[PDB]
Amino acid sequence: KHKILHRLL
Amino acid sequence: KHKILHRLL
Amino acid sequence: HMLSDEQMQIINSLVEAHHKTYDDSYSDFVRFRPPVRRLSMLPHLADLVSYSIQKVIGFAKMIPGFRDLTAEDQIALLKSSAIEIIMLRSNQSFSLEDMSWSCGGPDFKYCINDVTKAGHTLELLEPLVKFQVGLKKLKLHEEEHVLLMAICLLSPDRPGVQDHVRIEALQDRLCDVLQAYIRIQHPGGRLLYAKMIQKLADLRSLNEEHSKQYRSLSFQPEHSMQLTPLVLEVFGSEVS
Amino acid sequence: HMLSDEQMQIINSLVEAHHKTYDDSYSDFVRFRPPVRRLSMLPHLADLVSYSIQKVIGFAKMIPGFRDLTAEDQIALLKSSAIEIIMLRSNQSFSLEDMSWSCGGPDFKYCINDVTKAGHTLELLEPLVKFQVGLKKLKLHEEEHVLLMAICLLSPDRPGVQDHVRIEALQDRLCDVLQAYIRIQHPGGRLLYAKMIQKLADLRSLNEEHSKQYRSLSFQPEHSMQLTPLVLEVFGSEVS
Numbered sequence: 058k059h060k061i062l063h064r065l066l
Numbered sequence: 067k068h069k070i071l072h073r074l075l
Numbered sequence: 076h077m078l079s080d081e082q083m084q085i086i087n088s089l090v091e092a093h094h095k096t097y098d099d100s101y102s103d104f105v106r107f108r109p110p111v112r113r114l115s116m117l118p119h120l121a122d123l124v125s126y127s128i129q130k131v132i133g134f135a136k137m138i139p140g141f142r143d144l145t146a147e148d149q150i151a152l153l154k155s156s157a158i159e160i161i162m163l164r165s166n167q168s169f170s171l172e173d174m175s176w177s178c179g180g181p182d183f184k185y186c187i188n189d190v191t192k193a194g195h196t197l198e199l200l201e202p203l204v205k206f207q208v209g210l211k212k213l214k215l216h217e218e219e220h221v222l223l224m225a226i227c228l229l230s231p232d233r234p235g236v237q238d239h240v241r242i243e244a245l246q247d248r249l250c251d252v253l254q255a256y257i258r259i260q261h262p263g264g265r266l267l268y269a270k271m272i273q274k275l276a277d278l279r280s281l282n283e284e285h286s287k288q289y290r291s292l293s294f295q296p297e298h299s300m301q302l303t304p305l306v307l308e309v310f311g312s313e314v315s
Numbered sequence: 316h317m318l319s320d321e322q323m324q325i326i327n328s329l330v331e332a333h334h335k336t337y338d339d340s341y342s343d344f345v346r347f348r349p350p351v352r353r354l355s356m357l358p359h360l361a362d363l364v365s366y367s368i369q370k371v372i373g374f375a376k377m378i379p380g381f382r383d384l385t386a387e388d389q390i391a392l393l394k395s396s397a398i399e400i401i402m403l404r405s406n407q408s409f410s411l412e413d414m415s416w417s418c419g420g421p422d423f424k425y426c427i428n429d430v431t432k433a434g435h436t437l438e439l440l441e442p443l444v445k446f447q448v449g450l451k452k453l454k455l456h457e458e459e460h461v462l463l464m465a466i467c468l469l470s471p472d473r474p475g476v477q478d479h480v481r482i483e484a485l486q487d488r489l490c491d492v493l494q495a496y497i498r499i500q501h502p503g504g505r506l507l508y509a510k511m512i513q514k515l516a517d518l519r520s521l522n523e524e525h526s527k528q529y530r531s532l533s534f535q536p537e538h539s540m541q542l543t544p545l546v547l548e549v550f551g552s553e554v555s
């Protein structure tokens with residue numbers, strides 16, 4: 058669920 | 067789902 | 076016969092974004108798992124790529140417009156294009172001398188033989204290196220390389236994008252910038268824009284082949300365990 | 316006043332399993348992401364632990380009986396107890412001289428201050444080190460350390476176990492081995508078995524506190540991204 062991408066974004 | 071554990075086991 | 080303000084701003088903000096997210100000394104590489112020369116090189120290169128994805132995200136966030144896309148469109152574009160921006164940004168480390176990415180001494184110098192030892196066959200590395208030598212021959216200005224990365228990122232024709240009209244309108248604006256920049260600022264560059272556009276279609280074909288071989292890798296737990304949580308997120312297929 | 320054959324076999328197979336999965340030279344540590352002294356030490360220690368989980372699985376597979384448990388019971392016991400076997404096996408690197416795990420020179424020597432820089436508070440590291448110094452004082456025979464690890468792994472009272480009767484019957488057999496081994500082979504060890512049993516209950520209390528702080532960590536993507544795919548599998552809560 059792109060937990061890291063969201064955070065990085 | 068422990069894909070790696072299964073493999074390692 | 077002259078760029079706009081909003082034109083030169085786009086170049087300025089893109090070029091600065093690149094400087095902030097690309098170290099020409101490759102001095103953070105010592106923090107990766109070391110290279111080893113099975114798939115001996117998979118740990119080091121997995122970290123190489125994951126570090127790189129972190130940078131491509133930083134660049135992306137400063138492309139004008141990108142910030143205002145939905146979180147879902149940002150993810151969709153990053154997930155589908157990350158490997159292309161990495162192949163793109165690596166040209167700045169690629170050496171025509173050696174046919175290798177020379178990020179350091181003998182350790183962070185990457186033969187084609189190193190990337191095999193991360194589970195990639197020649198049916199990928201061969202056109203990968205033809206792409207790199209071609210891209211190097213184009214002797215791009217910083218302004219063009221940066222623009223080429225941004226245009227590649229803002230492609231509407233990627234799986235999962237929802238606002239393909241707003242995205243395409245952003246990609247359009249950037250293409251207009253590259254056409255104009257080359258027209259005015261690059262002497263002898265009358266075939267350049269078209270050659271740069273060609274490099275994108277090569278990237279899609281690299282992307283495809285790489286996606287195949289990543290799947291074969293990612294499906295073997297003994298190999299996927301050597302990857303990072305960011306790599307599996309970005310190259311995985313969770314979908315939103 | 317004498318061990319059985321099946322007794323001495325259990326000791327032999329356990330002791331050999333330990334030798335095969337524990338390097339006293341800590342010579343593979345150079346392949347981890349280096350230590351750094353935010354959470355500067357999280358990358359190196361995450362790799363330390365992941366490497367260790369790989370070893371604890373190797374040990375486990377050679378405990379007699381374990382192989383014949385269902386894949387689900389093996390996973391349940393490993394997931395709930397891995398951190399305990401790691402805390403256990405680390406005693407062999409812990410130095411009463413220094414109050415640190417000395418796996419190498421100044422780099423792989425781990426102060427309590429290092430583990431803070433991986434996101435652990437003293438409410439964990441304090442009893443962790445009391446546990447370690449206590450366990451070191453017990454001056455365990457290799458035969459006992461190995462047995463203590465196996466007994467800890469084969470606990471029926473762990474979340475997710477399904478065949479708690481077969482597991483407990485395996486744990487029972489091993490306790491009988493440790494009681495008998497100490498009775499016969501360890502002079503002056505008339506309170507030892509009971510002190511060793513005490514060390515298990517300390518492990519549960521460490522396990523609990525560590526599980527709390529891991530959750531807080533694992534819930535912050537900027538920190539969980541520094542972990543490995545094996546660590547998130549084993550310490551995560553997927554359940555079967």
Ligand SMILES: C=C1/C(=C\C=C2/CCC[C@]3(C)[C@@H]([C@H](C)CCC[Si](C)(C)C)CC[C@@H]23)C[C@@H](O)C[C@@H]1O
Binds near residue numbers: 165185292
């Ligand atoms: C990444 C960069 C650099 C080099 C990139 C390289 C050289 C090594 C092999 C790589 C990585 C290719 C592989 C086919 C990709 C494999 C991906 Si996986 C290990 C998850 C299977 C894609 C790009 C290639 C250095 C510097 O220019 C910074 C830039 O960012």
Ligand SMILES: C=C1/C(=C\C=C2/CCC[C@]3(C)[C@@H]([C@H](C)CCC[Si](C)(C)C)CC[C@@H]23)C[C@@H](O)C[C@@H]1O
Binds near residue numbers: 357363404425525529
């Ligand atoms: C692991 C071993 C060794 C050392 C273990 C150590 C020292 C560093 C801090 C650790 C790791 C604790 C922490 C509280 C655990 C943190 C786990 Si995370 C980084 C995923 C948040 C648990 C055990 C501790 C060396 C050698 O004896 C081999 C053995 O196997």
